Paper text:
The viral trans-activator of transcription (Tat) protein uses an archetypal arginine-rich motif (ARM) to recruit the host positive transcription elongation factor b (pTEFb) complex onto the viral trans-activation response (TAR) RNA, leading to activation of HIV transcription. Using yeast display and multiple rounds of selection, a new class of TAR-binding proteins (TBPs) was identified that bind TAR with nanomolar affinity. Here, we present four co-crystal structures of lab-evolved TAR-binding proteins (TBPs) in complex with HIV-1 TAR. Although it was hypothesized originally that each TBP variant would recognize TAR using fundamentally different modes of binding, we demonstrated here that each TBP binds TAR using a conserved subset of arginine-to-guanine interactions within a lab-evolved β2-β3 loop.
To probe this outcome, we integrated five arginines into the β2-β3 loop of TBP6.7 as the Q48R/T50R mutant. ITC analysis revealed that the new variant recognizes TAR with KD of 27.8 ± 6.5 nm and a ΔΔG° of +0.9 kcal mol−1, corresponding to a Krel ∼5-fold weaker in binding than WT TBP6.7. Again, the structure indicated that only three arginines could bind simultaneously to the Hoogsteen edges of guanine bases in the context of the β2-β3 loop. This variant makes contacts to TAR in a manner analogous to both TBP6.3 and TBP6.9. Specifically, Arg-52 interacts with the pro-Rp nonbridging phosphate oxygen of Uri23 when displaced by Arg-50—as in TBP6.3. Arg-48 interacts with the pro-Sp nonbridging phosphate oxygen of Gua36 as in TBP6.9. Arg-47, Arg-49, and Arg-50 retain their interactions with major-groove guanines as seen in TBP6.3. No apparent backbone stabilization interactions form between β2-β3 loop residues. First, the addition of extra arginines in the β2-β3 loop—beyond the initial three—did not promote additional interactions at the Hoogsteen edges of guanine bases. Second, the need to maintain charge separation appears to have influenced arginine locations and rotamer conformations in the β2-β3 loop.
Residue numbers in the entry: 6 to 91
The structure:
Amino acid sequence: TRPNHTIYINNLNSKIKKDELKKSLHAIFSRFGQILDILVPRRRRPRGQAFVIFKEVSSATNALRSMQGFPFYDKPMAIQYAKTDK
RNA sequence: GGAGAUCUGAGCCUGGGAGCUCUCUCC
């Protein structure tokens, strides 16, 4: 995997509802750059992962570095570059 | 077809979870 516009965040707190996770993510990650969209996809079992698509790859890079392992709803975020740019 | 829905619909697969397929709702 290599840098791209989208970051993949797993290990989120599934106890939080979708909309509240999307807005918290937007408020914290918008600090690094303009965000085009945030996806919290529906999966077979409790959704605990999201995609944040920044407008500039530089924003995804600093975000990936700064917020790596940072507590988010009492759970440390595990951040990656998306396998496929979204 | 499109858009949504399960810690609050479901069966498989996985067995150190970015998997597949259904069902339902709306257009």
